[PDB]
Amino acid sequence: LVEKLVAVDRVAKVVKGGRIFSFTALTVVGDGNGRVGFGRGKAREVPAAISKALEAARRNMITVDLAGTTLQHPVNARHGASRVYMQPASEGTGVIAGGAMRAVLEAAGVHNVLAKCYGSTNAANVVNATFKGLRDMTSPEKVAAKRGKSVEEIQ
RNA sequence: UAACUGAAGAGUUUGAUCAUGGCUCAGAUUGAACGCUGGCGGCAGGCUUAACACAUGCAAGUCGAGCGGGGGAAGGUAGC
């Protein structure tokens, strides 16, 4: 099970006579063959936050249907102010995307894809948008089943 | 046979946060200039500014089988 750590940030909370500092961690876990999830964790120390984030990522998982090593069709997704566009590519292209998208795509098992961010580049929001798009991608068999047709009829 | 296949972000407003929004950076390119340094070859390029003023040399001649004159070389013949 491959695990990636997207970002680590230090946050502060104000009390009388000083401030309390903490750490947040965003991580993405996956199997490399269509199962992927992400999570966040808050702690006083960085390793504890990473462990909690990994546990949350393992608890929140979905299944993604791929076409070999690439996407089925172009995808547009959004979450808040972050918008993402993803497009299938031919073999040998690679993963042409930013780090936040790259982590999710590589954990989910995509090898050739072109991706682009618009709007805000906040890591959590970008991961959310990419996750939603991968969740909502469809497939010819599902399309044929829903329309009451055959795969060769659908083309 | 073939004539196309293509898109990455980062820093900075606050005691944290999300958004909006400017500024800055990572690329490619040049008829370039400057600083330090400097062996060779091939192929290219070389006043972007004053359509400012120009010394000097060259950059449009050729035809005697169109024509009349006129020159200077030799040769031959004569004499002394």
From Swiss-Prot:
The keyword Protein biosynthesis does not apply. InterPro entries: Ribosomal_Su5_D2-typ_SF, Ribosomal_uS5, Ribosomal_uS5_bac-type, Ribosomal_uS5_C, Ribosomal_uS5_N, Ribosomal_uS5_N_CS, Ribsml_uS5_D2-typ_fold_subgr. SUPFAM superfamilies: dsRNA-binding domain-like, Ribosomal protein S5 domain 2-like. Pfam families: Ribosomal_S5, Ribosomal_S5_C. Keywords: Ribonucleoprotein, Ribosomal protein, RNA-binding, rRNA-binding. Residues 1-64 form the S5 DRBM domain. GO terms for cellular component: small ribosomal subunit. Part of the 30S ribosomal subunit. Contacts proteins S4 and S8. PANTHER family: MITOCHONDRIAL RIBOSOMAL PROTEIN S5. Belongs to the universal ribosomal protein uS5 family. This is Small ribosomal subunit protein uS5. It comes from Acinetobacter baumannii (strain AB0057).
